[PDB]
Design a protein around this ligand. Structure first.
Ligand code: HEM
Ligand code: HEM
Ligand code: 9OJ
Ligand code: 9OJ
Ligand code: H4B
Ligand code: H4B
Ligand code: ZN
Lengths: 404, 405
């Protein structure tokens, strides 16, 4: 049947009926539940049916379903696909698809914002070099002297029997991670592979802990070229703690723009293999994960030491204590630097309203509970106590293999 | 590769495959098109024989006598019993085996490293509500062990064909009362309101503290539940205090030492033990974060926060976070002071990683509910956050059942 969804702090109950229109399978079956898995294990009128749907969405979107602006566009798509085994989106259909993709993304806690999205059409792109300029202008628009702005840039759709446009980096801004022969890593351990790929394509590596990587940009069926971001573009914030004055002296810093460049944007059967998008950070992304994750910069113990805590045992909650001070120093710094950012408390509160908006508009909202609940203070936020239904709506952002 | 789920740990990069879920014979909440893993409660001699046979097989396999003559004789023995009396009965050691298995098979339990060490008390002879109370008193004494807590379960008679069930009406053996106020608010534990008013409807003389231990509502077959009050010295409590905040002690917060669930059904070989309370010991965050800081429980976060002189009028002061940490600290500190068994959420999840590693070798996987295994604070600061998990129902099982009223 149709799932009962309950908030356990409030006592309220909904019914997700939007899930009924899920056309692709998630990882689960009745026998096993694989909801905690980060990545998934894995003719022509399948395309044509995917594209019919998306068009129906778009015209229902702009109130005028079943007109003939509608049904003519239906015949365009059908005709185009019938003759070429593919078709093309009109720019405004693309702006719609891009907003629907964000709206539909079960893992995003920021979809209250989903309507306010700047879409740059960059399909008139024929080279790595053009790709670079597009990206450079994405970042300046999006960074916006620190008053950040949600933005996506969309490079040419994939094509049968032609390579893909790809951005090799996982994010537009990331820090180099140089493996030390001595087991260790200087910089961000999440970026070792790509760091070396850069080096491999002739980047002159630094030896810093927060060195900004260059971009490997790749036009179809050509070697990836390498581009170095004008240092002006990369807005960084130094971290410092509003009361702990030794904190600033930890040399910690984080870039301001969260822009993801390795996912696939799927609209109406069409796949866009380079379509980087960006927003602003939630504090816990920087302060809990990027800095305290054991397989990341992993600074819990350092801070703990300067906080003169009891590292000797876990039941002193030294880790917990350290973490809170880091998250505070990240909110402090960004606020003091006037760079946009949101705390996990503010974010999940707004997501709860989004849930309510969504429930009334579409009868539901696909959400991945494990990703929607922040990495600290789990039950201290309202989304913890909220049941969620998860499913794949299209348009959709997706994971795809790395181009090497 | 393998036709089984591939499971990865993102901290260590390590990979496993769950082969044990192939023996999950009962379907859960999710389907290919919808995941329902966040839901707390998703909704004949024929059928008995199957479950029966399966369990006996598990058993003889656990004692490495699978396909032996004792094995095939047990199966005939059960078939015979089911054939005449519609039901069948477990041997002592079968029961013990099943009880430990049901614990072992429990996805939401982070304490399962210990699953092999479980005192099973057989109360299948128990024949009155009066006797239920005595067994339950006995359990609490043994399990509490003056603060050196010991895990245990007590098993009262199984559901019988056309005969009322043994039921303990209370959710736990120890629960603080919830009193609906003249205002609308609740004094004490809002969770326990319904049971609290039921105690009263059944004759309890209610107090009015924040921490009034409820009486037991104990129901023998086809009899109205009878009220039983627990002798206060049997119910060990811990006065919460903070190692450096001297004022914390003044808040008069206490919690009881023994988590003991009394309303779950225990199922083995298709046999239903409607009343089979079991107990372990607390993990720090259960008390400090859920029970004391949940908006819909004692809700003391803002109060602690105000005492801490925090900016409770901005989310970004992380005043909620600062106070949550110190409340958990106070819980840990206080139980350690009182010499009462308690495990912090760090050390607990670390033990569970070892259990996972053990279960991988022993069975080919471990059924696990990620959202219940990850602590309610400091989530990613524990190893289990970075551990993918597979959730499926194995039997023997601890199940939920409707409230008897
Ligand atoms: C405007 C401010 C935004 C905030 C505060 C925000 C917040 C978040 C957070 C906390 C996550 C979890 C990611 C993680 O823990 O690694 C996430 C993921 C995600 N967000 Fe948002 N987001 C924002 C804007 C956007 C925009 C503009 C888009 C797309 C146009 C978007 C689409 C997504 C998608 C597709 C994911 C899944 C990430 C993945 O699986 O790699 N979000 N977001
Ligand atoms: C020995 C120390 C133990 C610890 C630290 C422990 C810890 C926990 C925790 C933290 C939960 C989460 C419950 C919640 O937040 O509501 C839980 C659940 C559970 N535990 Fe354990 N536990 C222990 C012993 C046991 C024992 C002895 C049994 C059974 C014989 C057991 C069976 C279960 C079951 C069935 C659940 C699921 C609760 C539900 O589904 O409502 N646990 N445990
Ligand atoms: C290692 C890994 C990591 C991730 C991380 C998820 N993506 C991070 C992300 C992606 C987009 C964001 C956006 C759009 C905004 C924001 N504040 N944070 C965002 C954070 C996903 C898959 C894998 C894999 N494999
Ligand atoms: C109201 C409610 C509450 C719960 C709580 C789950 N049971 C709590 C529990 C049960 C057994 C435990 C055990 C055995 C040990 C321990 N440390 N904590 C334990 C905690 C589950 C479902 C519902 C519902 N509906
Ligand atoms: C294994 C686990 O599912 C995985 O680490 C998830 C858990 N929840 C998460 N939640 C968010 N927001 N981001 C993440 O990367 C993860 N990782
Ligand atoms: C809605 C959500 O599933 C609910 O709050 C769950 C989350 N995880 C939990 N985890 C544990 N251990 N205990 C709980 O009661 C819950 N509640
Ligand atoms: Zn699932």
């Amino acid at each position: 049947k149709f799932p009962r969804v309950k908030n356990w702090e409030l006592g309220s109950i909904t019914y997700d009926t939007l899930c009924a229109q899920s056309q692709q399978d998630g990882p689960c079956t009745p026998r096993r539940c694989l909801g905690s898995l980060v990545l998934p294990r894995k003719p022509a009128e399948q395309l044509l049916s995917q594209a019919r749907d998306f068009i129906n969405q778009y015209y229902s979107s702009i109130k005028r379903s079943g007109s003939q602006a509608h049904e003519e566009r239906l015949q365009e798509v059908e005709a185009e696909v019938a003759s070429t085994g593919t078709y093309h989106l009109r720019e405004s259909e693309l702006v719609f698809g891009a907003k629907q993709a964000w709206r539909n993304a079960p893992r995003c806690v920021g979809r209250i914002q989903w309507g306010k999205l700047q879409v740059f059409d960059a399909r008139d792109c024929s080279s790595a070099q053009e790709m670079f300029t597009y990206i450079c202008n994405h970042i300046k628009y999006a960074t916006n002297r620190g008053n950040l702005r949600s933005a996506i840039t969309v490079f040419p759709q994939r094509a049968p029997g032609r390579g893909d446009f790809r951005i090799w980096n996982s994010q537009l801004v990331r820090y180099a991670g140089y493996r030390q022969q001595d087991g260790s890593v200087r910089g961000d351990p999440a970026n070792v592979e790509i760091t070396e790929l850069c080096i491999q394509h002739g980047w002159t590596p630094g030896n810093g802990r927060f060195d900004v990587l260059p971009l490997l940009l790749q036009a179809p069926d050509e070697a990836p070229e390498l581009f170095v971001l004008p240092p002006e573009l990369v807005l960084e914030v130094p971290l410092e703690h509003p009361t702990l004055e030794w904190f600033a002296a930890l040399g910690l810093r984080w870039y301001a723009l969260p822009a993801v460049s390795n996912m696939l944007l799927e609209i109406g059967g069409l796949e866009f293999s380079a379509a980087p998008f960006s927003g602003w950070y939630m504090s816990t992304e920087i302060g809990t994960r990027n800095l305290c994750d054991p397989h990341r910069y992993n600074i819990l113990e350092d801070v703990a030491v300067c906080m003169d805590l009891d590292t000797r045992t876990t039941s002193s909650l030294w880790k917990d204590k350290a973490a809170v001070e880091i998250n505070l120093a990240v909110l402090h710094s960004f606020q003091l630097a006037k760079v946009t950012i949101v705390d996990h408390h503010a974010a999940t509160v707004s997501f709860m309203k989004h849930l309510d908006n969504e429930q009334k508009a579409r009868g539901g909202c696909p959400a991945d509970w494990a990703w929607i609940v922040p990495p600290i203070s789990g039950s201290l936020t309202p989304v913890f106590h909220q049941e969620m239904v998860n499913y794949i709506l299209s348009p959709a952002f997706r994971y795809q293999p790395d181009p090497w």
